Amino acid sequence: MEMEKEFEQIDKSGSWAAIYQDIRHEASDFPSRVAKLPKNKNRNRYRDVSPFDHSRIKLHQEDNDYINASLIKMEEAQRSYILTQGPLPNTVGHFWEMVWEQKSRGVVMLNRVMEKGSLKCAQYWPQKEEKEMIFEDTNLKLTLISEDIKSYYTVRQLELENLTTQETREILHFHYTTWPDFGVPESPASFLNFLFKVRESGSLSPEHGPVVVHCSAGIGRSGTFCLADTCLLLMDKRKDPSSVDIKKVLLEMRKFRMGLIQTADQLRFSYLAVIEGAKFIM
Ligand SMILES: Cc1nc(-c2ccc(C(=O)O)s2)cs1
Structure with missing residues (x-):
């Protein structure tokens, strides 16, 4: 586990806040013009969490196509996820329309x-x-x-x-x-068993449209879910599994939706989930 050595280094040196800031610095910034239109103000739970225009999910309704939802496409892993906010009282209908349409x-x-x-x-x-x-x-x-x-x-x-x-x-x-x-689970065991249950259902399989993943904002816990799934999938695909860099995968996913992984603690938890999940395969 080269990453498990990177884990001990960052942990022993207490550099998590530092690694996290470099990810924040390197993260993509794309326009989110549709999200900021005044007619969409009550379709957003948080004014600072917006889908990028290029990756946003469009509703098939002529009036207003907008929902706070992004398509994450992980080309090499052949996995796609919709990340969205927890629906609002006025967007529950839009949420289910998106599930139907996708x-x-x-x-x-x-x-x-x-x-x-x-x-x-x-x-x-x-x-x-x-x-x-x-x-x-x-x-x-x-x-x-x-x-x-x-x-x-x-x-x-x-x-x-x-x-x-x-x-x-x-x-x-x-x-x-x-x-x-507050914070993250002490152990990733129950989170991994949950992730394997989702996989076992067929919900993440290419026969179906993308899985819808949400928390409140659709960036923090939702980010950890997708990051762990994609990293473990790449480990399985790859001839050189050690070549798998969590930081690079996270930056790719951040091209599609801003702010994925909200805290240095969620980043540490993501490493721990991937490291333990890799041990499950062996
Ligand atoms: C056959 C499989 N190997 C792995 C890994 C072995 C070594 C790693 C590393 O050093 O990072 S990952 C996951 S599944």
Whole structure:
């Protein structure tokens, strides 16, 4: 593990804040003009978190195509992810329209609806089988089919129905419920088991549209999810797995959405997740 030597070096020297700042400095900056139009102000949860115009997901509605969502395309890994913010009360319909239009099979949620006593996300899925949700603005119906509650995460089967065409699809909702209010998990074990559960479902496979990944802003925890998945996939593909540089992969992903990995602690956690996940393969 050359990276595990890089890990001990940065850890022993306590240089995480320093590595993190060099990533911040080197990160791409692309226009986000559509996000900043006044008519889109209530479609953004945070005024400083915007999709780049070049990678933004466009809704197929003539009126206003805008959602705070980015397509991450990792060419070498053959993996694509949509990263988005936790939906707002007024964007729950747009969220499900995007899931429908992009042919996504899975939604990965890395936050609780309430954290630190404030709402981080609208309740955008049904809590009971017999109480379905209708999104009048986008003509979609959503039903809870089943719910499997485990210690660290919940998996839900949902049926999404296009009321316009009466087509239905099954969507899997993967809800990681134990990310702490402050900092990062002590151990990456439950995060890796969650990531392997998503992979096992087929939600990340090229047969389907890209997986939708969100937390509150869609950059921090969401960033760690995609970064760990892509790094482990590249390790599997590569003739020289050690050639895998987490910092380079992160900078590539930052071409597609700003601010992925919010803290030096999330960066350290990403290294730890990848190092431990590589041990799982062996
Ligand atoms: C067959 C596989 N090898 C690895 C790695 C071996 C050595 C590494 C390194 O030194 O970084 S990664 C992951 S899966």
